Amino acid sequence: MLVLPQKLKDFAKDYEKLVKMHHNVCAMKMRFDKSSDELDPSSSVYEENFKTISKIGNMAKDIINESILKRESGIHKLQSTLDDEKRHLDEEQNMLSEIEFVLSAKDLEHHHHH
């Protein structure tokens, strides 16, 4: 029971996916980093490892891009919520100006009376 904008309730969904993904993202990244360090043209399992590091690379690019998508999507929800808050703020600041300006009009009117 957390009270939030709906756009922020929606953000909680792809953010959860984003958080749960993080393990696999960093894991696949290191699986590529290690494979990159071991790859040696002088070796006898080189051609096999060369094909493998391509599989690992593509698979790492896929999971990362999958994370980027959810990340970019979640960012737009944050930007949307931020715009809404800036609008409410802008309107509240408008109400403040009107009150002061109206009070100026009342004071002027109260002066010409005397």
Query: What residues make contact with its own copies under the rule CB under 8 A?
Result: 2-5, 8-9, 11-12, 15-16, 19, 25, 29, 32, 36, 39, 41, 50, 53-54, 57, 60-61, 64-65, 67-68, 71-72, 74-75, 78-79, 81-82, 85-86, 88-89, 92-93, 95-96, 99-100, 102-103, 106, 109-110, 113
Q: Is 13 helix (H, G, I), strand (E, B) or coil?
A: helix
Cα distance between residue 4 and residue 18, in whole Å:
20
Residues just before a chain gap in the chain (C–N exceeding 2.5 Å) are: none
Considering the complex, what minimum distance in angstroms separates the CB of residue 87 from its own copies?
10
Burial of residue 80 (number of CB atoms within 10 Å: 0-12, 13-18, 19+): middle
Considering the complex, what minimum distance in angstroms separates the CB of residue 71 from its own copies?
5
